Amino acid sequence: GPTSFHVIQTSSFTNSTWAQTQGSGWLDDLQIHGWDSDSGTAIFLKPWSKGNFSDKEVAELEEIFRVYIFGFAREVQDFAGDFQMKYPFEIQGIAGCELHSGGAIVSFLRGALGGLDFLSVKNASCVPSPEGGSRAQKFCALIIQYQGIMETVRILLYETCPRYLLGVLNAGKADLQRQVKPEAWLSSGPSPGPGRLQLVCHVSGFYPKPVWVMWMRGEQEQQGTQLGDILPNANWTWYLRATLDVADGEAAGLSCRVKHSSLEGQDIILYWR
Amino acid sequence: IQRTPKIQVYSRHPAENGKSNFLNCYVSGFHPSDIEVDLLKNGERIEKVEHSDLSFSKDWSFYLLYYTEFTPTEKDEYACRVNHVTLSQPKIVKWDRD
Ligand SMILES: *[C@@H]1O[C@H](CO)[C@@H](O[C@@H]2O[C@H](CO)[C@@H](O[C@@H]3O[C@H](CO)[C@@H](O)[C@H](O[C@H]4O[C@H](CO)[C@@H](O)[C@H](O)[C@@H]4O)[C@@H]3O)[C@H](O)[C@H]2NC(C)=O)[C@H](O)[C@H]1NC(C)=O
Ligand SMILES: *[C@@H]1O[C@H](CO)[C@@H](O[C@@H]2O[C@H](CO)[C@@H](O[C@@H]3O[C@H](CO)[C@@H](O)[C@H](O)[C@@H]3O)[C@H](O)[C@H]2NC(C)=O)[C@H](O)[C@H]1NC(C)=O
Ligand SMILES: *[C@@H]1O[C@H](CO)[C@@H](O)[C@H](O)[C@H]1NC(C)=O
Ligand SMILES: [Cl-]
Ligand code: NA
Ligand code: NA
Ligand code: NA
Numbered sequence: 138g139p140t141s142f143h144v145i146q147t148s149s150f151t152n153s154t155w156a157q158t159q160g161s162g163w164l165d166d167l168q169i170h171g172w173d174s175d176s177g178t179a180i181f182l183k184p185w186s187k188g189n190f191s192d193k194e195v196a197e198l199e200e201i202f203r204v205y206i207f208g209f210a211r212e213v214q215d216f217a218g219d220f221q222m223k224y225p226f227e228i229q230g231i232a233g234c235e236l237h238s239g240g241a242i243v244s245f246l247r248g249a250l251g252g253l254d255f256l257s258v259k260n261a262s263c264v265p266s267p268e269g270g271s272r273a274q275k276f277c278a279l280i281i282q283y284q285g286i287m288e289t290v291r292i293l294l295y296e297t298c299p300r301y302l303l304g305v306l307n308a309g310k311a312d313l314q315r316q317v318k319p320e321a322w323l324s325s326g327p328s329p330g331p332g333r334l335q336l337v338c339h340v341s342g343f344y345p346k347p348v349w350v351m352w353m354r355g356e357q358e359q360q361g362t363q364l365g366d367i368l369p370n371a372n373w374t375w376y377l378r379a380t381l382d383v384a385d386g387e388a389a390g391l392s393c394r395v396k397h398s399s400l401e402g403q404d405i406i407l408y409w410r
Numbered sequence: 411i412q413r414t415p416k417i418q419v420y421s422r423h424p425a426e427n428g429k430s431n432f433l434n435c436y437v438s439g440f441h442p443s444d445i446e447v448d449l450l451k452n453g454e455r456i457e458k459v460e461h462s463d464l465s466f467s468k469d470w471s472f473y474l475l476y477y478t479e480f481t482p483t484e485k486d487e488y489a490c491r492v493n494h495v496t497l498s499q500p501k502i503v504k505w506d507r508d
Binding site for chain 1: 411413418420421422423424432434436441442443444460462463464465466470471472475477506507508
């Protein structure tokens with residue numbers, strides 16, 4: 138996907154007495170901001186998490202988010218009845234901006250209710266999602282009247298975010314722009330049947346994310362290769378398993394080949410042996 | 411509408427007994443967000459287990475990474491135990507070695 142910074146929110150409304158919110162900020166898959174709910178302050182997980190922003194601007198953004206989180210739960214409790222919400226329910230939000238090929242930075246904001254699309258932002262206006270139903274159309278026609286909320290959202294999406302994204306991309310280039318070589322190893326999985334075997338190729342520790350793994354008979358791509366999911370390690374690296382359902386003896390002179398940008402053209406090749 | 415969690419277990423490095431390592435349990439695709447996840451050494455909850463802040467995906471389903479440093483032994487079996495509202499009973503997924 139295109140490079141993107143965004144903050145997210147998860148809000149749980151258990152009863153009209155109780156609610157809870159979780160927040161964080163992200164470069165794509167990599168978390169760079171936490172949020173201390175219990176003290177209403179931001180948590181910077183990288184030395185460059187403030188970007189090129191001043192401690193003045195950061196404190197201003199921190200105060201807007203603190204007021205928003207404080208206010209958001211109360212305003213939902215307040216309007217719950219008029220929206221005919223039954224507890225418990227939950228809400229999620231993501232807002233940010235992404236750098237697209239061609240230089241143009243595109244901002245976005247999306248909200249969900251019960252894990253289902255509820256609204257999104259376009260042309261700096263509220264746009265109800267068909268899945269959000271009557272409540273979504275009621276919400277967008279309502280929020281449009283609070284011009285201060287609309288003003289702040291409009292500024293943060295279109296003024297602050299594009300600046301902050303470029304700032305932070307550069308500020309963290311030492312971590313963001315690096316090549317980490319994977320290690321790879323072979324193993325045998327749970328046999329699919331009798332005589333049959335499952336050849337397993339692990340690839341771990343690569344950065345950045347794109348990667349290519351296939352089971353090989355010499356230069357022939359075994360089209361039966363099943364590719365698992367790319368899974369995270371803690372140290373900003375990834376993990377991937379490629380497996381192949383094969384009959385015994387058919388797994389003779391089979392190799393696992395790994396292409397990755399950090400390998401300088403020297404693919405890892407592991408022969409079953 | 412609820413979504414049950416997918417549960418995948420893996421080690422950072424290939425298993426070498428005596429060599430330090432990291433055991434990972436990635437849990438994803440679940441909704442709502444409340445969830446309980448443990449790593450087991452021979453059936454017993456491991457104490458100091460780190461984990462990620464809540465995040466979610468394009469489709470709004472949630473995901474977490476739990477992990478811990480450890481050193482595998484010939485005798486030791488390792489697994490990941492996840493409880494969630496969509497699970498009528500805790501789900502265990504073992505760590506496979508060769
Ligand atoms: C944090 O970093 C961001 C991202 O870099 C930064 O915003 C950018 O600032 C630069 C200046 O440092 C802007 O560059 C200028 O943009 C204007 C109009 O957009 C251009 O007309 C300018 O071109 C002339 O000036 C240059 C000298 O800087 C000459 O080299 C050039 O040949 C032209 O004569 C100039 O390039 C850039 O547009 C912004 N971009 C955005 C999206 O804001 C921000 O200021 C940094 N600090 C903070 C606190 O955000
Ligand atoms: C409104 O909802 C909240 C949150 O669901 C309710 O608070 C909860 O009250 C129960 C009452 O016992 C607490 O249970 C206890 O939790 C601890 C763990 O913290 C557990 O070890 C105990 O055995 C016991 O189960 C629960 O913690 C508490 N939740 C929170 C977040 O504080 C509240 O009662 C509800 N009120 C109304 C009027 O509906
Ligand atoms: C966004 O699009 C709408 C289309 O109806 C247009 O009327 C409006 O002027 C545009 N710009 C805004 C809302 O800033
Ligand atoms: Cl995988
Ligand atoms: Na944290
Ligand atoms: Na504050
Ligand atoms: Na790890």
